[PDB]
Ligand binder design. Structure first.
Ligand SMILES: *[C@@H]1O[C@H](CO)[C@@H](O)[C@H](O)[C@H]1NC(C)=O
Lengths: 55, 153, 50
């Protein structure tokens, strides 16, 4: 009787709004794991850091 | 007319601090800083993010001071990210915002009130010099600041 | 990214089912997660062969 509920979000050009939105949404959904899987970032920084620190 | 943010979480004499807020002699330089004091809780980091977002959006905060009463190093650990990602510097003076983590970011602007590991090692060796005890041993766990202490001693 | 995410999701599913066999299964609220380090260490011991 275990169930797997899925939640996905897309990109936004900013890194604070994306951070806060993802944090609040995946906190409210009470998720267990978070993934980052985008190579072709126009930003050369390659920063998933806000997601990592917030989670 | 700089904007200074004061955030207090936990029990504290807010009225005494507010009365003693204007206890400095800053009349010799045209600064007239603006200080806003706000109380907060220790619910979650995202609440702190929302509070600082609102404060900097409203009052144009150019400086954040955090004081708390917890015993968790995560406060400054996450505050480092905000300090690095925001041009406004942040300061920690008491509570959970006082313990020094490993290191700050290159773009970080967050500072703390306290001594370094090496200064504490020097004081502890001064104590061992004061009372003649010259035989000792050192044991530690895998907290990041262990190599610094061992090499300093 | 296809097979990469496929393998990652398979690993996540096996780890979640492995953790479901244990006790004291709390959940993150909307304080720290008291099984935070516990879950992290469970994921650290994640060995697989497929
Ligand atoms: C799945 O997540 C969505 C979005 O957070 C939520 O609206 C929904 O109630 C969840 N459903 C289940 C079965 O948990």
């Amino acid at each position: 009787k275990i169930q797997l509920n899925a939640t996905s979000v897309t990109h936004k050009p900013n890194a604070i709004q994306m951070a806060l939105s993802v944090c609040e949404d995946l906190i409210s959904s009470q998720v267990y794991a978070i993934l980052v899987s985008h190579p072709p970032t126009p930003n050369d920084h390659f920063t998933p850091t806000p997601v990592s620190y917030t989670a | 007319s700089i904007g200074i943010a004061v955030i207090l979480v936990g029990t504290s004499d807010e009225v005494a601090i507010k009365d003693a807020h204007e206890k400095d002699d800053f009349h010799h330089l045209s600064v007239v800083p603006r200080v806003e004091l706000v109380a907060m809780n220790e619910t979650d980091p995202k609440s702190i993010i929302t509070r600082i977002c609102d404060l900097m959006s409203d009052r144009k905060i150019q400086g954040v001071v955090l004081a708390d009463d917890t015993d968790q190093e995560a406060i400054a650990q996450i505050l480092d990210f905000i300090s690095a990602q925001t041009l406004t510097p942040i300061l920690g003076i008491h509570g959970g915002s006082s313990m020094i983590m490993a290191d700050k970011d290159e773009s970080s602007m967050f500072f703390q009130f306290g001594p370094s590991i090496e200064q504490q090692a020097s004081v502890m060796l001064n104590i061992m010099e004061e009372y003649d005890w010259y035989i000792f041993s050192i044991v530690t766990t895998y907290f990041p600041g262990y190599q610094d202490f061992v090499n300093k001693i | 990214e296809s097979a990469h995410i496929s393998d990652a999701v398979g690993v996540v599913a096996q780890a979640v089912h492995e953790l479901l066999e244990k006790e004291n299964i709390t959940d993150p609220p909307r304080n720290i997660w008291k099984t935070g380090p516990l879950f992290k260490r469970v994921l650290m011991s994640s060995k697989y062969a497929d």
